[PDB]
Amino acid sequence: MESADLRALAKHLYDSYIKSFPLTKAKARAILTGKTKSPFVIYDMNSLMMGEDKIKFKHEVAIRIFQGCQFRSVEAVQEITEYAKSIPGFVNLDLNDQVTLLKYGVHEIIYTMLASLMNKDGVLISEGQGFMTREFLKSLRKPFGDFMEPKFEFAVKFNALELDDSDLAIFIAVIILSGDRPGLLNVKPIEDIQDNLLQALELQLKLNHPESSQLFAKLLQKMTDLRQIVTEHVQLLQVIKKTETDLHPLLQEIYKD
Amino acid sequence: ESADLRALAKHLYDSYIKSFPLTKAKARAILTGKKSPFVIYDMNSLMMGEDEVAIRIFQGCQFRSVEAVQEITEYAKSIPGFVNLDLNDQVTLLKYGVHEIIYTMLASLMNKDGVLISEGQGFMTREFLKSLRKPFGDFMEPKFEFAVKFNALELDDSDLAIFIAVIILSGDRPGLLNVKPIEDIQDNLLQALELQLKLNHPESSQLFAKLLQKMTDLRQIVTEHVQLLQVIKKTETDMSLHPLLQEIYKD
Numbered sequence A: 001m002e003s004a005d006l007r008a009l010a011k012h013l014y015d016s017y018i019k020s021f022p023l024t025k026a027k028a029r030a031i032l033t034g035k036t037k038s039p040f041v042i043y044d045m046n047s048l049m050m051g052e053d054k055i056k057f058k059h060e061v062a063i064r065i066f067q068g069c070q071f072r073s074v075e076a077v078q079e080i081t082e083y084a085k086s087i088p089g090f091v092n093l094d095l096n097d098q099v100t101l102l103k104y105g106v107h108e109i110i111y112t113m114l115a116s117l118m119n120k121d122g123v124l125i126s127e128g129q130g131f132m133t134r135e136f137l138k139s140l141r142k143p144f145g146d147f148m149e150p151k152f153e154f155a156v157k158f159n160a161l162e163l164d165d166s167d168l169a170i171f172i173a174v175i176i177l178s179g180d181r182p183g184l185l186n187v188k189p190i191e192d193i194q195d196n197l198l199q200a201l202e203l204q205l206k207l208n209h210p211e212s213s214q215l216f217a218k219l220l221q222k223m224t225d226l227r228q229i230v231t232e233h234v235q236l237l238q239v240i241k242k243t244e245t246d247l248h249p250l251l252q253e254i255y256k257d
Numbered sequence B: 001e002s003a004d005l006r007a008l009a010k011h012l013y014d015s016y017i018k019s020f021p022l023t024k025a026k027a028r029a030i031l032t033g034k035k036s037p038f039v040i041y042d043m044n045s046l047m048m049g050e051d052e053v054a055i056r057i058f059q060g061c062q063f064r065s066v067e068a069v070q071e072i073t074e075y076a077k078s079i080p081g082f083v084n085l086d087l088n089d090q091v092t093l094l095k096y097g098v099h100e101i102i103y104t105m106l107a108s109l110m111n112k113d114g115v116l117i118s119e120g121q122g123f124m125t126r127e128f129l130k131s132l133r134k135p136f137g138d139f140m141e142p143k144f145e146f147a148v149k150f151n152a153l154e155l156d157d158s159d160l161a162i163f164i165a166v167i168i169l170s171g172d173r174p175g176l177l178n179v180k181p182i183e184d185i186q187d188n189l190l191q192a193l194e195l196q197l198k199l200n201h202p203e204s205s206q207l208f209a210k211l212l213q214k215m216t217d218l219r220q221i222v223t224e225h226v227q228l229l230q231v232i233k234k235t236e237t238d239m240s241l242h243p244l245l246q247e248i249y250k251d
């Protein structure tokens, strides 16, 4: 509720974000824009085969990539969970609620941060050692030629706000501490925390992007688009489960819906 | 420009009063007993009130909704700058906007136990609405759940007038030809809305943020309604009547 308290809250979260997420947006942009480090580019199947001898990927093609993308998701859930521990008040909440906040929250956060790794033309993979193009992913077979595209569409819009990491660290906390999750036992203390985080985000954006009229409101409006991407991904995953499939214990739990 | 924001705000509340016959203030007075409405809680109650059922109620809610679209279209005329936008862009904004607004404004007629109907001359219970045939009676409850959360923000008409304008001027609707002027207008509205909530609810921390957060839930509920409406079109044949009427009320 005090300006210096809010700046303090912001530094705390930026700190834990740096410590919890190995690839920041600043590091990714440096790789993406050529600033002094350059990735191997995957645009076709021969490039894909060429990639393994260069990067440590692959841990039928469209399947190896989907499963590889899912294995990457398990890491993302782990990093997000670590970051969330350090949000003031989160570990004090009721255990069930802590679990529920993570249940719905991780996917919206993965896609928020996946935007840090993308441009119009493709996405960084394997901790920035590779770069897979959108048209290659778009051209994958069966239902897999479509799981990545709506992420690209969001990112292009999302990256237009030019947020930096110190902006994102607070935004991510706001996503987790949302009292509208299905099944929360005690909404009042969850919401109380978000008043603090929203207050910090409001000031952080005013200071960091003072020329950006209504960035705060515009950034919150983006939570609408995040929700829509998660709906589609959960549905496309119930289709794979019945066709081939054959899901990490972490992924098994987040997929109860 | 604080005076500009208070000026913009009083303008819309003025126009909103003139465009929408049943305000939230007026509806809340009727809900609380502060002329009592006819209450529909069962099937015999329905037959007596006017002077297959689940379809008659759905069709009745749509005919009512189409009346509100004309009222919303008129209110949008009064948003400063809106009539100067490209006509194509105006149609597109209303096309995608009306649903979110109809749901926003439906919450003013709603409480835990039911909803005002026919300009406040009736009251339909939620316990009646919850229990309808499998396809129907399931498009309703998510509205009630939304409203209760929404009505907990305790907004009044002068808040909603600006909130409604904000929905209308969303520069992300598919097919917009010229987004800059739409967004420039929406900046003014958000500034005006922000000021409105601080003055009106000086004790309500971060209400502005909380209200914008609700637009996430509005989009999700409209999506679901758009989905259930693709199901009735292919499954329910009795929803035919005059071909002209299907033409009038399809939207």
Ligand SMILES: O=C(O)c1ccc(-c2nn(C(=O)c3c(Cl)cccc3C(F)(F)F)c3ccccc23)cc1
Binding pocket: A056, A057, A058, A059, A065, A068, A069, A070, A072, A073, A074, A076, A110, A114, A117, A123, A124, A125, A126, A127, A132, A148
């Ligand atoms: O080193 C590896 O084995 C490997 C390492 C990474 C990938 C891979 N990750 N990914 C992502 O989308 C991703 C990223 Cl890049 C970072 C964090 C979270 C994600 C998440 F959304 F999947 F959860 C992809 C998309 C498309 C194609 C390949 C990949 C694949 C393989």
Ligand SMILES: O=C(O)c1ccc(-c2nn(C(=O)c3c(Cl)cccc3C(F)(F)F)c3ccccc23)cc1
Binding pocket: B057, B058, B061, B062, B064, B065, B099, B102, B103, B106, B115, B116, B117, B118, B119, B129, B139, B140, B141, B143, B144
């Ligand atoms: O003012 C009125 O007479 C009135 C006005 C609205 C309702 C009402 N409509 N509704 C719908 O789901 C609905 C339907 Cl079913 C068809 C088309 C459009 C809608 C819409 F309003 F949501 F947009 C509801 C659900 C739950 C509770 C009350 C209602 C009822 C009465």
